[PDB]
């Protein structure tokens, strides 16, 4: 039982890696903002793990509650074109 909650921090590390790669690879930016919200949640989780739930909640009510509301509030109103992730354009890096 004890060690079922031993590797939660490593899980959050792996999940943050995933959400970063997904922010970078997503086609429509709206999805990239949703993955940013997933990342702020994972950060709030990790902060609860190390004993700072107050900042977890301040993050959820600041970043997610305002900044990301606003990011969607912008991309909903602007004509932000894109260029889907490719191999001819980005492999060189």
């Amino acid at each position: 039982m004890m060690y079922l909650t031993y590797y939660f921090i490593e899980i959050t590390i792996f999940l943050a890696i995933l959400c970063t790669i997904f922010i970078i690879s997503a086609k429509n930016p709206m999805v990239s903002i949703l993955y940013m919200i997933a990342l702020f949640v994972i950060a709030a989780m990790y902060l609860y793990l190390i004993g700072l739930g107050i900042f977890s909640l301040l993050y959820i009510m600041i970043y997610i509650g305002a900044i990301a509301v606003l990011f969607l509030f912008i991309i909903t109103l602007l004509d932000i074109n894109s260029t889907e992730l490719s191999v001819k354009s980005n492999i060189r890096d």
């Binding site: 191999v87 001819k88 492999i91 060189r92 890096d93």
Partner: protein, 179 residues
Amino acid sequence: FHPYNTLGLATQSAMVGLGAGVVAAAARNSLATGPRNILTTFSKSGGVVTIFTGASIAYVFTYCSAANLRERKDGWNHMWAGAATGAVLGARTKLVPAFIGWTVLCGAACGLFGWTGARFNADRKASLEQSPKGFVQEDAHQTFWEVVHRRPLSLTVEQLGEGRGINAVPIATATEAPN
């Protein structure tokens, strides 16, 4: 002095210069204009790889070699190394005079760089701020930055040499009458 290891330093220097060529190749492939890919790095690069490797090889090989042939550590070595490096870089332009010019002027610049100490930094203890200065007190040996009201004559004759007016004893007293 303590001798240099020519081949040990040259092999390190070549791997370093190859690595710098790889970094500059990738950075050019990213910063360039037209359609490219992971293939162009070593095909369409303007000799960044051979530039860096030949320079680092020639510089370090010549510095350690001439430091060991002259058997000293000084600025003339860095001059010879900059002379080799100028030859390598100027061989790219397939002309004799530009090859000679690249050699001489890269050599003079590296030779100056060795004159001033072969560093862009400062020693910080050989400097004037952190070193004795001003008037030496009582007959003590005159260091570099120290000033002296009256110098010894033996030290003058040694540093300069005899002749051309400069002598071990003055002229009148040398030709004074023993009376």
